[PDB]
Structure formats: structure tokens, C-alpha cells
From a paper:
HA is a homotrimeric integral membrane glycoprotein and forms spikes at the surface of the virion. The HA1 subunit is primarily responsible for binding the virus to cellular receptor sialic acid, while the HA2 subunit mediates subsequent fusion between the viral envelope and the host cellular endosomal membrane. Structurally, the HA1 subunit demonstrates a globular while the HA2 subunit adopts a hairpin form composed of two antiparallel alpha-helixes. On the basis of five human neutralizing mAbs isolated earlier by us from the two recovered individuals, we first solve the crystal structure of three representative mAbs bound to the globular head of HA with distinct epitope specificities, neutralization potencies and breadth.
On the A/Anhui/1/05 HA trimer, the epitope of 100F4 was located right below that of 65C6, across the receptor-binding and vestigial esterase subdomain of HA1. The complex interface occupied 1,041 Å2 surface on HA1, and 620 and 475 Å2 surface on the heavy and light chain of 100F4, respectively. All six CDRs of 100F4 were involved in the interaction with F55–271, and the epitope consisted of 21 residues. Finally, the 21 residues had similar degree of conservation (93.2%) compared with that of 65C6 (91.9%) and providing explanation for its strong potency and breadth. 65C6 and 100F4 exhibited the greatest potency and breadth by inhibiting 15 of the 17 representative pseudoviruses with an average inhibitory concentratiion (IC50) of 0.012±0.010 and 0.031±0.020 μg ml−1, respectively. In contrast, epitopes of 65C6 and 100F4 were located away from RBS and their major mode of action would therefore be expected at steps after receptor binding.
Author numbering:
A (entry chain C): 48 to 214, 221 to 265
B (entry chain L), E (entry chain D): 3 to 214
C (entry chain H): 2 to 134, 143 to 223
D (entry chain B): 1 to 134, 143 to 221
F (entry chain A): 48 to 265
The structure:
């Protein structure tokens, strides 16, 4: 049986737009049926990076196992529960992608995040995260204390260091993804504008799919 | 189904292993194996999830691993308060998918001292007698290990019917309780000189007696 | 965060078993969690019934999918299980849980459990008889079905020294249990000891006064 | 010799109708010199009377069951039948048929052998049969079934001497298990074939097992 | 209803009586009292009917009387073969009438020599083993009196779960039988040097052992 | 609740006429409702002795307990299962009164009966029996081997010695012979003594007078 994304896109599904709650957990699929211009995509406006590349990989995946890799409950020094926007509604209330976390400052301070995760699963791990490009300097301090920030992500086969490009929603968000090979580790470091991973996907079944 | 042994045992301080083996459509297919602990009187509690990731309050000594179609919970530094039932969990991709559980494994801790039965015996109440019924109640408490035989005696000669005996149950303090009930008629109760409850535990027989 | 199961204790076969979970703190809205039912049959082993997400999307156990329904009550901080066409196979301790959105679902927080016996044997309430007497005194809670039975002393005012023994299952399929409490000999006396027996499936509610023999 | 035999389903769903027949040999279900009766024995050992039937079609039922019981004859097969409607767990019992004198305290002279009937609505489950390999002892393990009973024979009944079929255990899961052992000469262990035949009628299990060293 | 004691006992050669008391609408109304004998594995059999009228094959030693609301079965010259359950029956004139029975009385004969457990222990079969199950079977036959405790051992260390044991049942020759079942995993069976079945009967323990 | 005899008579009921199977066992009654000329009476032709007197006794009885006092299975030397007649049909088949037994010779011999019953039932016992007056000498020998026979019955308060009166009467229900029936009340601890070498309709069942008080026949 196919995976029939409805008005949801691959990005919407994989990031977990609250509009895509039908696909919070998805059984094994044969192939994927996506629409041409799906209504429910990126919650918050922006770009999903290497989208075509990822869609291509999906043509070889038949099922994901979603795991929790950074518990929301483990952000001691950052606010992890008020990162919501009326662009991403759930039951008509401000929400956000379910698989990632919009970290905001706690008590006018955003300590440097230096987090790291070793893939002790026996399979390839698909990991998505993001960076927020804010409107203005005011928005920038209101959300993160630090006016000059960066996103830093790295594996054996990845080196990302991004600086947010500041200039219903007038800011943007970039999303990114990588595949973490078994026994490799991923390292996150940021002092603002970081959309952290909460859930990730083990690539559990392969063989032939396709996007339609 | 996942298959675990009904029981494993160890002495305080050493290591015990609980295997959990499945098939090509769950653990062999690559899905995580979670573990739950159920203490004797209570609901289960999450012990390990994902790939050896412990919730807060689970000590270092609890550890899960996984290889091929089989998974493993290890307990090092066995403490007596670890005597509980352990259940392994995973996902099975048959038929739109299912959460799947083992049948549970009971861990027994071995370095434990014999405790002798406290025995309380009650004669029938007057209210029951005037209802033309009669019941002697023999109550056995706080003994270890949990194996007893109960013999009812009427004027020292065995009575071999109307007896109803529990099998011993583990309590909160890792000792056992048990009870036996003898049904009599009121004239039988009033006719003999006395009745005795004989409880035999680890080579010692304890007798209590009541009379009209 | 506390979860509490409740519902009938005895259900007739072919009818619909029904349970609700009463939730406190961060309620069945959210959308960050699964709201789930599990169960534990005689001769243990955990069994999954299903998950529900606040959006109304659900994932049931394939052995039961056609009989199960799990629905929320956002305006009451409940969610409910509804299992139709029950049989003796559905006899179990049922638990509710709050779970992570992982595909191998992570049952983080569990309820306390509630026994449900599917039987078609008619319920039978207990006869309560005093076990007359530091001294020990108690109550015989005789010939009932099904489990469970709560016993308290002096309306809960007396808890120290109370031991309620596990029930026996007689050859007839009826249960008996005893609850004993140990008290000072000296108060036996001037202090009144009443035991309160409660068997919800038979709407039995009995007080018994316990004194020494006369 | 007058012989009586009960037969019928072993497992009955609740609210359905329990149905049993008694097959009579060595006397007809005629004439009218006798009552043709059903009794039963619940767990909670008590004997309980169900009813008497007379060949004329007149009946006397237990007033606690009158509305649910039916006892009818089938003269052209020398049977008579019990038909008990709307059963519940309360009707689980060993049922007996009997031929009785016409005394008002009725005299149950000749009894059948007994037939267990479990009213449950739990699905039947058939046994797994495993050889217990070894003068020597050998046998069959009849594992994890529901409900009772299970009949075991050896070499289709050719071997009865030295055979002991143990009572079943009732596991915590609610399934039964039993073993049957037969004690044999070591010298024939050997050249003699030992087959055990297991029968569990509610699940239609019919299994032969060869038992070897 | 008629009321009998659950059990009576006597020594071989002496006399025992089983009372049966009813009320004004049965025995007290003057109706006869019948008696039936039930041997352990078999159907009941008519013992006495009318006013002490014995069917052929019933000895003189069995005798019935009746006075007021109670009736009495007397068994003189007690023999071990009298060990059975005895039921009294009568007619009750309530509601168009009913045949009415007692709950049975078990006659125990007291002068009986101790018989020791015969214990046969069996390892799991090859067939069960390749189905990834295992069961040790311990059979206890021909002991008196009918009280045993069974303990399973693995390399001399007790195993306290996965055990399923019967309570003793009377055989046709007045001795008792019982059986115990130990559930194992195949890897458990193949791991230890041996498993042992320990049977304790009247203060003496007999151990049988099997090995892979 | 009353005892409604339908087309059955008191004689038909107490003797156990196969047409009266509705009354094989009768619960306690207040009074008895009998018709004027009931269809089902003495199926085998004859007479019921002291009938009016028995009916009067019944006006003081509220219930009977039927007991077996002579097992049919205890006639070692007599045939007790082929005394049946097309006068007494059961389902259109030859039968006979259920409470009494028409004993016939077995193996061409009818030994003298010397039977006795002591009333150990603690209550007054109603006992019925009969004598068969056969058609002719031939039938007498066909049934009993002996041409010269008698019935002898006695209790403390009864002494009966009857002889069958052989001659062929007009047919009633196919039958040209007759039967006389008799009854007595056997007090607790008394004995009844039976003796015959032919033509004896023996008791099988008898009735304990268990309940008394006000009844009536209507
Ligand atoms: C019939 O009577 C004769 C003569 O007394 C006897 O020898 C014969 O065996 C009898 N037949 C039977 C079947 O009893
Ligand atoms: C009948 O039996 C009783 C008691 O057994 C006895 O005392 C009495 O004399 C007997 N009657 C006759 C007529 O023998």
C-alpha cells in the first residue's frame, strides 16, 4: 500500500508540520504519492535545502523508524516550549513542526549549545535541523540574547557553519538534513537562531519506492 | 511476539542478562527494543528506550544492547530491590504495524535469608454460626522462601476437605503472605475439642489451635 | 502528571468494554504526545491496544483494530477506550499511558491499572464476618466475584498495622480474603474497630463491628 | 447390561443453547417404566438435579431451571436429549444422564459416565504434542490447551497396562497441560512401536506421535 | 438444600456416620432420603434408597436412618475402599417440587501406611527444542498422604518462575498423584550443566536430575 | 393448588393406568377434581374394592410419596415384564398399570410366592395389589402353570385368602377376564405378607401418606 501524502509535502511530513499529523507515524510504504503544489509544506516560510536530493533518496526507502535523539526535556538553560507561530497552527493555536525545536533564550541569556549525538543504532540515521533568519536586530535580541550568532553542525562527512541572514511572518527559516552513518557522531554548536533536532529517522527498510 | 526467559537469577552485586529474541519483521528488521520494569504490585515503568537511552531516575547499572534478531537487558550490581518483572518491547511491521511485547522475565535475587511464617488462626464468628455456617481462617505472613504446606487437624486427626489454600504471594518487602480457609458445619465445630492449623515451612512445622 | 484509569469492573461477553483515563497537568491537547491504552491478561505479558494523537489520528493493534476505538475529551481532560464484542480473552489489568511520538512508541508515564473481568457469570457480593481477637482482629470478606475488594478500618482513620491478605480463589470460582489489623491489647476495650468492605461490581458496601468474644 | 453415554459439545459460547444426548443400549427409551433424567456437577462439587422425562412426554424440571430446560426423546435412535438455553458460566459442569425409578424422591439407579461442558466464550485452543523420550518409562506431553478434556490412548488402545495419564495442570495463563506415561520393558525399546493418540475435540485436534529413545 | 459436613474420618473397622440435615419442606416433611457414592474419577452410583433399601452389590455395612429433619448414613466396618464422596438426596415440596441434594461428604480412612513419591523427570524433546520452546516434566505418583512441595533447581540454584505445579489428586488405589512443569528457553536448557526436580514428601526429599 | 384429574379416575391414578401418565408424580394438592364418569379408569376390566372408602380417606390426605417396596428386578423365578395387555395401551402398545405387576410363569413354572414387607418408612403406607380372574382353564395354564391357585394377603389387621373365579365374561376392552383390586393401609412397623401360586397382581410401588389436612374430591 502506497503512502498517500494528502496536502502535505515531503518537507511537511519529514519536519512534522502540525497540519501533517496524519503522518506522525507512517507504516511501511511501497511508493509515495505527492501532489504538485501541496498546501501544507513549510509551516514557517523559508527553504528546504537539498530537497530534490532527499526526494531522490526516498525513492530507495520503504519505511522509517522515528526515534527521539534530543529529548525536549533536556534543554535546561534554554526555553524549548514557547517556540510557536500562528503560521503553524494546531487546532487553531500557535504551534510548530513536531520533529524540531525552536529554542528561545531563558532569562535574557542563551548559553552556547555544545551538544553531540553518537549513532549507536545499527542503521543510517536521517537528521533534520534548521536556522532562523530574523527580521531585525530587535527581533534578534528578543528571541536569542546574542545579536551575533551562528549554527555549527558537523559529522565525518559534513561541515556546516552558518550565520543568520538578518533582514503573517516576515523572517525566514532554512532547513537542512544529513545522513549519519552508523558509529559516526553529529556535533551541534550554536549561540542563537538554531532549530534543534528532536526526532530523527532510522532508515530501516530499503528497496524500491518512487515519488508520484 | 518476542521471546524472553520466564526467569533469571543472580546474587546481589553480580551481573544478570535477559535475552529478548524476535524475527525478521521486528528486531531482525532493525527496530528499537525498549524495556520496562514491573515491581510486584504496581504498573510498569519505562527503564530503557531507543538504543540504550535511560530516562531520569534509571541508574547506570541498567543497560540494553541488541544484535541481529535478539536484544539484551543487562543488570550489573544486582540489588535486592531489583526483584521485578522485566518486559522487552519492539515494533513489528506485519499488517500495518503493531507494538509488540515479550512475555516478561522475572529476576530473582539469591542472597536472601530464610524468614519464618507468622501464623494467625481465627475461630468462626458467632454471626456465621447462627447462619449455620463455619469457617476457620489461618493466616501466614512474612516468610521466605515462598513455599509452605498447610494441614488442618481436627482433634489431631487430618481433615481432608473443605480446605481452600492460597499459593504464596510476594509482598512489597520481598517476603511472602498466604492464607488457608477451612469450611466446617456448626455442629462439627462444636463437637470436637479443638481444631489446629499446621503450617510447614523449610523443615519446621508450626501449629496454632482454636476451640469453641 | 498523573494518569488514572476507571470504569466498570465486570463486563458481559459480546458487550462493549469502556474505560476513561483522567489526566492532570499538560492535558490531552498538546499534540506532542500519544495517549495510549495497554493491557495485562492473567498469566502476565504486556499487550498494546492503541495510540491516539490529539488530532484524532490513531494507530490500533492489528488483532483488535475492528473492535477498538480511542477518543479524546479535550473539554474534560479525559481520553477513553471503547472495546466492543468482548470475550474472556479481554479479561485483564488495563493501563493508560502518555507516550513519545516514536514509531516504537515510548510509554513514558503509566496509569495505576484497573482490573476488568469479562465473564457472564453474575456478580456476587461478599458476606462480611468479624474475626474476633498486642492483639490481632480482622474481617472475613467471604464468597465474592469478581475481584477486587477494598477493605479499610474506621473509615481510613486506621491504617498502621493493617494487612489485607491476597484473595483465595475457591474451587467454586468465588473469592475470599481477610484483612487483619493489630492493635494494643489495652484498647479492646474502649476503642471501636469497624471494618468497611467495598465491592463495586455488586454495589456491596458493608460495615462490620469487631469485638472480642462474649 | 444397560449402558448410558452422554455426548455433545465440550465448549459452548454463553447465551447459546447447550445441547447433549444420552445414548441408551440394553433397554429402549421406551417404555414408561422409567424416568429419563439429567443431572450435573459444577465446580463447587455439589450434585444438582436438572429434570426427569417420561416417555409419554410429561416432564418435571428443576424449578430454578424450568424456563430454560428441555428434555425430549428420540425413540428411533434410542437417545434422549437435554437442551439448555441461554447458558452462562454458571452452567459449566460435568453433566450426567440417568435412568430412574418412578419414586417421588426419584431413584437414580443407573448413571452415564459424565461429560464435561465448559461455557466460556474464550476461543478453544488445541494442544501441542511432544514425545517424552526415555524397565523403562516413556510418554506424551499434551501442552497448552483449552478447555478440558483430552483423551490419550496408546497404540490405539492396544496398550493399557502400565499406562498412567496424569490429571491436567491449570496454568496461570488459563491453559491446561497433561502428560501420559506408559511403563514398558527396557528390552523392547527396541523393536516395539509406541504410538500415542491424542484427542482434543473442541479444537478438532487428532494427533499421533511416535515415541522413541 | 440439605447440609452435609465437607468431610468425616474414622479408622478401619470402626463406624462412621454422615449427617444430612434439611428442613420442614423436605426431610422434616417425611420424604425419603437417598444416598449416592462417588469414587474419585467416576460418576456417582446409587447406594441407598427409600427406607434403607440397598441395590444389589451394596454391602450390609452401609445403612441409612432418618429422624425429624436429619438423616444419617452409617458405614460400619470401615475399609480403605470406602474412601469416596457421599451425597444425600431428597424431595422438597416448594414450588411444584424439586429433587434436592447435599454438597457431598468425603470419607477419609485413617489407618493408612505412608507411601513414598515415585518421581519421573523428562528433558525437552528434540521436536519442542527446534520449535524454540522447552519443558521439563516432573511426574509424581503413588504417595500418601497427598501433600508435596516441588522445587526446581538449575545447577543447584533454585528457579522460581516458569513453574506450573498441580495439587495432588487421589488415584484409584487411594494414593496421590501430582505433576510439575518447568518452562525454559532452549538456550537456558543448553547453558546449565543440569536441572533438578526436588520433591519433598513427609520430611524426606527425593531429587531427580536431567541434562542436555 | 388443586389436583386436576382429567379423564383419569382415582382408581386409574392410584393404580397407574398408562393413560394416566400425567399423574405418575403429583405435587401437593389442596383438593382433587374428578369427573363424573372418567374415560381412563380400570383399563384392564375389573373392580376396585372399597373404592368409596378409599376416596373418603383421600379427603383427609394432602400428598403421597411414591416408594418402591418390591423391586420388579427381584422376581427371580417369575416373569415380571410380560404381563401386559392391549387393554392397557401405552402409545398404542401393550402395557399395564404402572404401580402393580402382573406376574406370569417363567420357564413353564410358577413357584409359590412367600414375600413380605415391613413398614420402616415411619408413615402410614398405602399398598395396592390384585387378583386376576382368568377366562378359562386354558388361559389359566397359559399364564400360570397351575390350574388351582390362590392369593393370600395378611397384616395385623387384614386376613385375605382369595381364589380366582374362572369363567368367560363379556369383553370389555378386548378382555373376557377380570381383575379385582385391593388396598390396605400398612401402619408403621407392621408387616404385610404375600403368598400365591398364581393369578397374583403384585405391588411394585406403594404410597406413603406424607401430608394430611383438609382435602376433598369434587
Ligand atoms: C427350565 O426348567 C428345567 C427343569 O427344572 C431346568 O433344568 C432348565 O434348565 C430350566 N431352563 C432355564 C432356562 O432355566
Ligand atoms: C418390623 O420391624 C420392626 C423393627 O425392625 C420390628 O420391631 C417389628 O416387629 C417388625 N414387624 C413384624 C410384623 O415383624
Amino acid at each position: 500500500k502506497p503512502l498517500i501524502l494528502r496536502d502535505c509535502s515531503v518537507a511537511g511530513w519529514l519536519l512534522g508540520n502540525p497540519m501533517c499529523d496524519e503522518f506522525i507515524n507512517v507504516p511501511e510504504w511501497s511508493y509515495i504519492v505527492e501532489k504538485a503544489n501541496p498546501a501544507n509544506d513549510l509551516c514557517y516560510p523559508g527553504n528546504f535545502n537539498d530537497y530534490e536530493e532527499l526526494k531522490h533518496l526516498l525513492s530507495r526507502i520503504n519505511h522509517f523508524e522515528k526515534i527521539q535523539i534530543i529529548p525536549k526535556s533536556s534543554w535546561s538553560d534554554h526555553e524549548a516550549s514557547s517556540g510557536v507561530s500562528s503560521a503553524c497552527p494546531y487546532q487553531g493555536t500557535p504551534s510548530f513542526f513536531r520533529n524540531v525545536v525552536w529554542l528561545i533564550k531563558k532569562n535574557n541569556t542563551y548559553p552556547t549549545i555544545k551538544r553531540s549525538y553518537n549513532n549507536t543504532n545499527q542503521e543510517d540515521l536521517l537528521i533534520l535541523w534548521g536556522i532562523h533568519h530574523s527580521n531585525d536586530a530587535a527581533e534578534q535580541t528578543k528571541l536569542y540574547q546574542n545579536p551575533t550568532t551562528y549554527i555549527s553542525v558537523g559529522t565525518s562527512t559534513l561541515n556546516q557553519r552558518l550565520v543568520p541572514k538578518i533582514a503573517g511572518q516576515s523572517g525566514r527559516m532554512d532547513f537542512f538534513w544529513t545522513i549519519l552513518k552508523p558509529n559516526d557522531a553529529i556535533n551541534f554548536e550554536s549561540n542563537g537562531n538554531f532549530i534543534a533536532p528532536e526526532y530523527a529517522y532510522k532508515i530501516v527498510k530499503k528497496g524500491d519506492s518512487a515519488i508520484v | 511476539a518476542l521471546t524472553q526467559p520466564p526467569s533469571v537469577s543472580g546474587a546481589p552485586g553480580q551481573r544478570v542478562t535477559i535475552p529478548c529474541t524476535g524475527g525478521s519483521s521486528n528486531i531482525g528488521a532493525g527496530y528499537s527494543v525498549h524495556w520496562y520494569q514491573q515491581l510486584p504490585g504496581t504498573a510498569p515503568k519505562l527503564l530503557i528506550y531507543g538504543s540504550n537511552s535511560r530516562p531520569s531516575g534509571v541508574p547506570d547499572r541498567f543497560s540494553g544492547s541488541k544484535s541481529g534478531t535478539s536484544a539484551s537487558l543487562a543488570i550489573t550490581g544486582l540489588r535486592p530491590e531489583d526483584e521485578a518483572d522485566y518486559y522487552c518491547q519492539s515494533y513489528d511491521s506485519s499488517l500495518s504495524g503493531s507494538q509488540v511485547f515479550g512475555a516478561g522475565t522475572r529476576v530473582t535475587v539469591l542472597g536472601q535469608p530464610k524468614a519464618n511464617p507468622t501464623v494467625t488462626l481465627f475461630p468462626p464468628s458467632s454471626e456465621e454460626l447462627q447462619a449455620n455456617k463455619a469457617t476457620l481462617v489461618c493466616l501466614i505472613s512474612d516468610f521466605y522462601p515462598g513455599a509452605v504446606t498447610v494441614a488442618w487437624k481436627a482433634d489431631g486427626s487430618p481433615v481432608k476437605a473443605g480446605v481452600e489454600t492460597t499459593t504464596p504471594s510476594k509482598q512489597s518487602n520481598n517476603k511472602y503472605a498466604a492464607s488457608s480457609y477451612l469450611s466446617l458445619t456448626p455442629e462439627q465445630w462444636k463437637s470436637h475439642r479443638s481444631y489446629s492449623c499446621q503450617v510447614t515451612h523449610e523443615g519446621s512445622t508450626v501449629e496454632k489451635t482454636v476451640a469453641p | 502528571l498523573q494518569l488514572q484509569e476507571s470504569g466498570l469492573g465486570l463486563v458481559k461477553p459480546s458487550e462493549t468494554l469502556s474505560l476513561t483515563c483522567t489526566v492532570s497537568g499538560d492535558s490531552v491537547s498538546s499534540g506532542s504526545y500519544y495517549w495510549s491504552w495497554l493491557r495485562q491478561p492473567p498469566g502476565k505479558g504486556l499487550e498494546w491496544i492503541g495510540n491516539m494523537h490529539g488530532s484524532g489520528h490513531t494507530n490500533y493493534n492489528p488483532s483488535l483494530k475492528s473492535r477498538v476505538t480511542i477518543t479524546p475529551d479535550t473539554s474534560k481532560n479525559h481520553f477513553s477506550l471503547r472495546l466492543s464484542s468482548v470475550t474472556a480473552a479481554d479479561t485483564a489489568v488495563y493501563y493508560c499511558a502518555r507516550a513519545l511520538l516514536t514509531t516504537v512508541t515510548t510509554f513514558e508515564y503509566w496509569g495505576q491499572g484497573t482490573l476488568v473481568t469479562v465473564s457472564s457469570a453474575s456478580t456476587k457480593g461478599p458476606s462480611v464476618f468479624p474475626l474476633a481477637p498486642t492483639a490481632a482482629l480482622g474481617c472475613l470478606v467471604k464468597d465474592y466475584f469478581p475481584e477486587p475488594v477494598t477493605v479499610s478500618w474506621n473509615s481510613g482513620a486506621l491504617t498502621s498495622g493493617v494487612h489485607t491478605f491476597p484473595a483465595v480463589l475457591q474451587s467454586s470460582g468465588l473469592y475470599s480474603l481477610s484483612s487483619v489489623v493489630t492493635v494494643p491489647s489495652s484498647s479492646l476495650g474502649t476503642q471501636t474497630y469497624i471494618c468497611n468492605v467495598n465491592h463495586k461490581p455488586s454495589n456491596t458496601k458493608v460495615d462490620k463491628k469487631v469485638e472480642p468474644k462474649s
